[PDB]
Structures are given as C-alpha cells and as structure tokens.
Amino acid sequence: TSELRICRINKESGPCTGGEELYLLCDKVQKEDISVVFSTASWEGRADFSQADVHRQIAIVFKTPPYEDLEISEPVTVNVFLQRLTDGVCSEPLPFTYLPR
C-alpha cells in the first residue's frame, strides 16, 4: 500500500508514431520497480526510459511508446499510468491522446 500517482505531464498529445520525450511529476517511486504504461481498450504499451531517468523519485523523463495502429486517421486518446514491476499496482490513469499523421 502506497498509492502511486501522477501529478501532471508536460504534454497531452503527441505523434501516434511515438518516440517523443515527455516529463511527468509523481509521488515517490523506486527507480528500480516502476514503469510508465499507455493503455486503451485492447492495447497496452510500456513507455521507454531508464532507471537513471527517474529524478529523485518525483519525476520521470521517458519516451512515448509507438502506438499499435501506426495509421490511425483520428485523435486516439489513451490512458497513461504508473505501475510497479513487483506487485503490479498502478495509478489513476491520465489522459494522453495520440495524433494521426
């Protein structure tokens, strides 16, 4: 027990191709067991980043994971949430929408 959460994100939309770099402020997280995840109805993607990229357990610089449908032609909003590697516990999801083109 220790509700991990995300205070805010520096961006609300990005290219559906992913690889974009963002920042997120959050409640204490152990740089080891922790991972940002983007999810939808039938899809899940783990964002890319390294242990070093977690700043004093309060923020994490990571790159958005390429979306599943790299050809959508409409703003596909998804869910963004933390999630320890051990117990699988998450965090209230944040709204991040992928962009076409």
Binding site: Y23, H55, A59
Partner: protein, 115 residues
Amino acid sequence: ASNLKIVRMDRTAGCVTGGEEIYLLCDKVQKDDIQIRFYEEEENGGVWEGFGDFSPTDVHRQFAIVFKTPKYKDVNITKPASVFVQLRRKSDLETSEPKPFLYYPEIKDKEEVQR
C-alpha cells in the same frame, strides 16, 4: 559550489514573447524561497533579468518546478538571443550555477490567427 543546482529541463529554448510550459528538474528547494531567474550580461555595465512565473503549488515535491517563460526584454528581434537561467533563493539570494537558454523571434506576425 552551492546548495542550488538546475539538473534537467524539457526545454532549453522558447519564444521571446514568453509564457510557455517548461519543466525544470532541480535539487533541494522550498516552494517559497526559490525562483527561476533569467538574465543577460548587457556587456557595458548593466544587466537584464526576467523571472519565471510559477506559484509555490507548482514546485513539486521539492525537486521539480513547472513554470512559465518571462517575456524577453526586447520582444522585437529578428535574430535569436542567448541568455542564461539559474535558480535563486529570495532569502540569501543564493544562486545556482547558470545554464544557457535561447530566445528566438515571435512567428512572423503571429496575428495569422485567421483574420
């Protein structure tokens, strides 16, 4: 050699107009004795400053800060202007090592909002 230090920044450059979302990952700070001071060595005598806009509610868990860019002095310039940014303590005006920041021209007549 100090107690203050800027570590990361989602952005290192913004418009001369000012008012843009910039995330700064710092060291130890208190939401009410810290400030994002932008400056420039006039080079002749004086100096220029401008402070990032941000409420203490923005200074996340003591090691991060979200703020807005302080409109550069001369909003009218056709060539990028390079300045500096440093954290500073209102109390003892202690100062973090500086980091470079780039100010560039406002889009050719931004008023192209479609009218």
